[PDB]
Ligand binder design. Structure first.
Ligand code: FE
Ligand code: FE
Ligand code: FE
Ligand code: FE
Ligand code: FE
Ligand code: FE
Ligand code: FE
Ligand code: FE
Ligand code: FE
Ligand code: FE
Ligand code: FE
Ligand code: FE
Lengths: 142, 142, 142, 142, 142, 142, 142, 142, 142, 142, 142, 142
């Protein structure tokens, strides 16, 4: 179902939320201030997705996963490991975003196949959002 | 340590964050709109605590817990079981808040004993905050 | 005199101010939040009237009553009444407003008769204000 | 033509506009304030659609229907009947929204078939909007 | 009754609302932008009147007409015929406003006669509003 | 005519505008700052009246006087002899306001007699405005 | 009890509210404007305290006094005899504030003794507030 | 003296103020709205100049002219001229602005010669302002 | 590639940016103010497109053209020729927009064919934007 | 050098900053509130100058003095002896401002002579600023 | 002519606008975010200059260059070559700004010589602006 | 006395104010912009403390030190130190903050001992503030 695509999104984003807080809290170096900031911007966005998506499946008669327990057993995002570097962190969520772009494309496919371009449009937005981030994060590194 | 009091706070608040979203998403009845709203207000506040507290222990040389995994193994808050009632939900977090008031009083005790009224002050604020909520939540029911 | 009409208004509104706070503080039930709010809106309005009217008689050479003592001995609004219901409270100030509409019409009569449509206009405004409230309050009940 | 899909939207929304005012004005009960409010929110949105859609067909060389007379002979929304209940009203427009989701899907079909995903995108938005409302309205009831 | 004066106002304004949208949508010429704008300003105002008036009669125990059907059988405003001119449109609603000034004066008469200067005051405001418009609209032409 | 009452208002206010600037510029003493300010507040208000009134007579088919020349030959306000005192200035415009209250009452009389309570309402507002000022100005002195 | 300390605060502040309005209305002299203003600032603050405190005792299971009648029989603030001086008024509430500082210190003592530094913190704030005012009020005089 | 240059500015601007109101009030045609607006923008600007300049000479020990009487006997700006065209009006103040540019250049000359580039700078600003207007006004015509 | 579609957009928009400034600067007539304004609105929008598009191709691994030199050798928009009329200018960019709608449709085709509805969505937006403008610009003329 | 003129400005303003705080803190009398305020306004302005000037010399390759030590050995402003009068304070900084006008004129001379009208322009602004203050301060006294 | 100085400014700024976008888009490294931002700030400012200057010459009877074609054949700014470094870019526009300071000084010379300190003042501002930037840009490097 | 603790705070903060400006002005490197900014944020905060503390001792009958002269002879903060590194500066005030935490703890001790938890609370706030900064500053380095 599409509800499953969405529910995995919920789980993933929920993980990102915490993971971004971690990086928000543990980042260090001459890029502290700028990165401390960026991550808060990112988890704020993550929180937005969590509610929209949930309310989306909620709008299509689905039941959104709503326990960290479930999130953990369904999310494919690997939580923080600590000790990460400032660059490590940027590198880390950047990969996370990219690995999510694929799951999204797949998600729009099935959404469209289940005659639900509405949900597809929602997903398309997130896709556009992350793609821009990936570029800036990448440019920060490369 | 005080860091432990704070880190349990972080874990508890993190759980509340998700639990409040759950109620935000699953609430029903003629109190929908007003309760759908209130819960969002509450998880927004919860998110504030998560960062202040974390950054507090972070300011006192501690290392904030930052994985849902840890949160789950340390929080004392019961993750939402489904199918609750609108009143059930209100009743539910109301109890959660009250059970937290006690842990807070204890938390200020030790904070003060460890010569740290700063952290105690932080905790005192949350206490005041929840007490008001408990009253309003309670008055909503009783 | 017109000053007497106005001074009774002052007294009445002053009582309403406190009475609305009481209801603001003691209301209970599933209408808590919405009614807790409405009453604050109402006593805020009441406070507005208290100053305009006072400053009105003050603008027409009068001397505004300014002690709770006098208010009590001149206001015709009940007050107190502790164990009141949420509906009881709505029902209560709704009647208070209606009983004030009459005193207002009378007040505009004498204001006009004393060649003071200015004060009449001021009173007319309050009249319009209360009439709308009465309707909403009433619709809330009926 | 697509212009016809849009023009029916215009008519429908125009009806909703008035119908929502009716409910805005005639609603009663302990849900007054909250529902009095919600309906105004809804007719404000309806008014938005009326202008966008009109200006859309206007942008694609069409001529928007612009008389209540025509609206009445083309809209499929059944105007108010009075006597409705607070729940009745919520139940009423909720059904109206759902019956409009179908007409929209159909509308996007033909839009796409006439090589106009632009108009389809416009319609898709309204679809998403109503779907969320339907859920909240529904949750209010069920 | 006064309720009848008001209800005709509601009907008239409701018609103006649509008629102003029509002109908003169909206007053309070097005065497009400025007139496209002005009409939107005007139908926004019209919508304000619709609700105030309705809520007025609603505040005086009346029942506001709330169907386009009734509006059509009671309004005295001519629904826009198409093909008008930019000047034609300005000329058109300008006359509409003037024809309304008379009905208003009459309306205040009866309002006053029925001991209701409140409603008269409401009507007086609209009068003042339209008179200014008529002048500007007129000056635009003459 | 009523146009004559209004046109005298225009002239008077126009004079006040300049006279208030004079006091704004020439005031001195320990009340400088507070009075320097108050006068600017007053001439700003004066400017408001000049336009409303003008546009009022303009709305009732009249032709507003629009030359300082005419203003001078029709206004009854005493231009500012120079060298006044801070108290003198306050005392000065206070008298001007009071002398205008009378002309206003007269103005509303004729407005009403000419079946124009609209203009009367406009004038009524100014009356209310000045009466308050007079009190504050007076209290400043007495 | 602490509830009694708070309830006396409520009563005192309620009296201050009216007493400050009195001074707001009856003040005179070259300090009119500045003092007319200051008092309004003060009674606005007073109103804030009335609600916080009430809602505080309300949060700790207490029942806030809510009738002017009770206020009068419990407040220790001297209602305003009439005819005071501008300086008299400043001198008057300044003393009132100082006499309240003592009751507050006492209030924090018992709050702390009853293991309620929360309420103590609330009271501490008011203390800080008044102390600053006292200085400015004093400096205004001395 | 420089005070004389400035005082003529004051007088001129004062005249412009009224003259712009006249045009604001008597303009007509298809350019009504846009010109009705522009003139108000212009007299608002004029009022700004009147106070800055006055306060400028006031800052350099001068005494600003402050009576319409003096303004009339010193200003070089025409005034009156009733039956003027929309274009006539634009053409009219445009010439007024240009004739002021010359007086300004002269004014900066003497200001500089009297070792007062401060006043010169002030004047320079107005110059720049008017030059832009002249262009737009001109482009409106040509 | 899609990058080529986007890069031509960049070039085109960059040209429009300058061309719109030209019209912004050289426009004349009784439509000056309104058209002077509109063009600034348009080049502001153009600038928006330039950055979004660039950053879009930048997000899809492309390299955005970034020299006026390249813009000139790739854009299909014909720069201004001066001497244009107010109507000429409106007529001019109106055609430019329409000629761009076609290039856009083509652009979405290839975007979709290269499995990139993201970019297609971006382009779709611009399409909708221009279509509305074309209508208003057209209505201004016809 | 010009850097020396600027650096003396920095020192002077730095002294003013503290001196204005002193007056802000020690002022007394019936002018307390208004003067308490004015001084804060002034030291806020002073702080602005300190940074602009510093950053100015910083922009012209200079090195801004940045220690209170240096400020003291170079500033020509008389630190505040204690116990001044309210009028004394006003009189005090007023003289300080005037004594600075001269140093500024001199400063613009050398700035211009060193082919740096940029810095001169900066200084010119401060000059204009202080001149206005001097007048108001003076008018407050005289 | 002065028009020529200004028109070269227009051309130069126009080039800077694009060149700054280039750097905005192609910058990379740990300074990405901060520099990506700064450049946008800079091209925003550049765009401001383009219009002010153009409108300046437009105000002095000149005809502003308005084609990228002309810009290219008259600007002295080197269009970005690709592959620069983050530092390279900063170094690059920093030099551009400095090379512009000289052309500006020359520009004010001739402006002054042609009796046009107005335009000189305009140019002086830009000078001040760039000088500050150069310092910050420089400090970023050195 | 407590006044002495506070007065040292005043002196210290006053020094910090200047010292932070120095760093604000002399910082260099790839961290320029971000550090140039941070320091301004810090001295703005410092200025806040200077006034609160002063006004605090002022509220407790004390007399705040108010001359740079005294500041210098009582502050324990270094100052000067010209050729400092970007990191050096961060390292520098970070140590300053930490050395202030100790003086603050001591300060709260004596405040509490002198029965003044009010002042203690004020100090507690600053403590919390600095502790957070120290962490961020530290994380920036380590
Ligand atoms: Fe939500
Ligand atoms: Fe944070
Ligand atoms: Fe008041
Ligand atoms: Fe529209
Ligand atoms: Fe309504
Ligand atoms: Fe006007
Ligand atoms: Fe409350
Ligand atoms: Fe002024
Ligand atoms: Fe960008
Ligand atoms: Fe700075
Ligand atoms: Fe422009
Ligand atoms: Fe202060």
């Amino acid at each position: 179902q599409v509800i499953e695509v969405l529910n995995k999104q919920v789980a993933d984003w929920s993980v990102l939320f915490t993971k971004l807080h971690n990086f928000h809290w543990y980042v260090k170096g001459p890029q502290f201030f700028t990165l401390h900031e960026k991550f808060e911007e990112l988890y704020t966005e993550s929180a937005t997705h969590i509610d929209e998506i949930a309310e989306r499946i909620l709008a299509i008669g689905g039941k959104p996963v709503a326990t960290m327990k479930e999130y953990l057993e369904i999310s494919s995002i690997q939580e923080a490991a600590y000790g990460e570097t400032a660059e490590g962190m940027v590198e880390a969520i950047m990969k996370d975003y990219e690995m999510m772009l694929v799951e999204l494309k797949k998600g729009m496919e099935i959404a469209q196949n289940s005659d639900d371009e509405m949900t597809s449009d929602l997903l398309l937005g997130i896709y556009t959002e992350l793609e821009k981030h990936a570029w800036m994060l990448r440019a920060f590194l490369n």
